[PDB]
Amino acid sequence: XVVXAX
Amino acid sequence: LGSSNDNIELVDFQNIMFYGDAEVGDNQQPFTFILDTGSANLWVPSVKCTTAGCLTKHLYDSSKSRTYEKDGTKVEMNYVSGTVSGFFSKDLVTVGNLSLPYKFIEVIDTNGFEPTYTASTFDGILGLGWKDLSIGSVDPIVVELKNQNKIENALFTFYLPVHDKHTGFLTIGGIEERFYEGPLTYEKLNHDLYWQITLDAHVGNISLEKANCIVDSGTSAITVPTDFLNKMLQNLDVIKVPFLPFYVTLCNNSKLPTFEFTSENGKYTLEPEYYLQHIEDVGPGLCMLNIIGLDFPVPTFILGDPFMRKYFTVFDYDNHSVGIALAKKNL
């Protein structure tokens, strides 16, 4: 897996 | 309590990630969040949610909050792992024991965040990044709390839990020695966006100077640029299942290297025991690297939970820096 913002 | 220091207790999730709680509306309404320094927006699943992912979640009811302040601005929250839809609303957010009129997103469509959302125990995500990282330019929570003289210093801190050893804390306002060992060391942010700093990346003989390093509590793994990952899995006896970010290795593999990050201020290392994930059910004495190839616009490493699990981290808004110290094995 989980990779958090763009 | 502890003068100007909050303390939202953290609980591990499947021993990889960790959650903490907070509330919206003047009638509390509790929600389990992923405290993400990797994002700068706060969203919560709304009673108006119609997607399957919400079935299992705690929902927000504005009509039950004397504080609710409508808006309705349609909004899409985009992450690397997924996307979440809804609209802006403002109400009384309560973190730790401090409240404040805060702007956030009411999510009504969580289809773009599957299967992650339904397979997890959290309800929403609470960003702890910088103003420039948000949507609808929202000043951070710790910043506002400071700009509202509710806390002493515009900074929070993390002491991740260890499943059956000790819970953890998201201290706001100030630094507490009970959480770390040795001296703290500050690294300046190279930008006020993500809690991103600059360090030299050195694993085996592979090395990337002045690599962008994002300290992100919202990431379950250690992100590494693709090229770097490939060169790193060389003379190692690791098995990449074809087309899967699944790297299997014997937990005792004596070839497994130690990540080495350095600056002129300090040296931070991450040994195999920190980035290896036991996979005993798949095969005895077997482990997976919990590392992943991810290429950002500029060579970046995302120091996720694995790093923060070993290193107590301080996120200073006022001084625009990240404090790093060894975490106490126990409390």
| Total tally of structural domains belonging to chain B | 2
Could you confirm whether B216 is annotated as catalytic?
Answer: yes
Neighbours of B245 (CB within 10 A): 15
- The whole-angstrom distance between A1's CA and the closest CA on chain B is 6
**Of the residues B120, B146, B177, which one is the last residue of a structural domain?**
B177
Q: How far apart are the first and last CA of chain A?
A: 16
Burial of B239 (0-12, 13-18, 19+ CB in 10 A): middle
Residue of chain A whose alpha carbon sits nearest to that of B124: A4
- Identity at B330, one-letter amino acid code: N
Q: Are residues B61 and B133 in the same domain?
A: yes
Are B47 and B188 found together in one domain?
A: no
What is the sign of the dihedral through the CA atoms of B293, B53, B168 and B264? positive
Catalytic choice (B6, B36, B123, B316): B36
**Same-domain pairing of B96 and B16:** yes
Do B259 and B115 belong together in one domain? no
Catalytic annotation on B12?
no
Residues B127, A3: C-beta atoms closer than 8 Å: no
Contacts of B255 (CB under 8 A, 6+ apart): B235, B236, B237
Among the listed residues B132, B128, B124, B129, the one whose alpha carbon sits nearest the alpha carbon of residue B170: B128
Residue with tokens 């502890």: B2
Interface residues of chain A, partner chain B, Cβ below 8 Å: 2-6
The reply to whether residue A5 touches residue B127, judged by beta carbons under 8 angstroms, is yes
B181: left (phi over 0), alpha (psi -120 to 50) or beta: beta
Q: How far is it, in rounded angstroms, from Cα B266 to Cα A4?
A: 27
**Catalytic, out of B91, B216, B305, B316:** B216
- Which of B13, B17, B79 best probes binding to A when mutated, by most A CB atoms within 10 angstroms? B79
Task: Report DSSP letters for B183-222, one per residue.
Answer: EEEEEEBSSSSSSEEEEEEESSS-EEEEEEEEE-TT-SSE
Q: B78 and A2 in contact by Cβ < 8 A?
A: no
Residues B172, B156 contacting (CB under 8 angstroms): yes
Other beta carbons less than 10 A from residue B174's beta carbon: 17
DSSP tag of B238 = -
Single out the residue of B278, B268, B261 nearest to residue B16, CA to CA: B278
Residues comprising chain B, all counted: 331
Least CB-CB distance to A4: which of B39, B78, B83?
B39
Contact B317, B323 (CB under 8 A): no
Size of interface A-B (CB pairs under 8 A): 51
Q: Which of B177, B207, B225 is the last residue of a domain?
A: B177
- Bond prior to B257 in cis (omega within 30° of 0): no
Does B129 lie in the same domain as B79? yes
Show the domain range for B96.
Answer: 3-177
Check if the beta carbon of residue B124 is closer than 8 Å to that of residue B39. no
Q: Is B322 helix (H, G, I), strand (E, B) or coil?
A: strand
Question: Which residues in chain B are contacts of A2 at CB distance < 8 A?
Answer: 17, 34, 81, 116, 218-221
Say yes or no: B235 and B279 in one domain. Answer: yes
Last residue of a domain, one of B134, B151, B177: B177
Resolution, angstroms, 1 dp? 2.4
Same domain membership, residue B183 and residue B161: no
Let me know whether B305 and B247 are in one domain: yes
Cβ contact A3–B133 (<8 Å): no
B234 and B87 within one domain? no
B170 and B182 in a single domain? The answer is no
3-state SS string for B131-183: HHHCCCCCCCHHHHHHHCCCCCCCEEEEECCECCCECEEEEECCCCHHHEEEE
Q: Which of B75, B76, B80 to mutate to test the interface with A (most CBs of A within 10 A)?
A: B80
Q: How many residues does chain A have?
A: 6
Alpha-carbon distance of B245 to B292, in angstroms, equals 7
Show the DSSP H helices in chain B as ranges: 141-147, 226-232, 272-275, 305-310
Relative to beta strand B168-172, strand B180-188 is unpaired
- Does residue B236 share a domain with residue B153? no
Phi, psi for residue B330 in degrees, rounded to 5: -140, 165
What Cα–Cα distance (Å) separates residue B258 from each residue in B207, B276, B279?
12, 11, 20
Residues B52 and B169 occupy one common structural domain? yes
**B100: domain CATH number?**
2.40.70.10
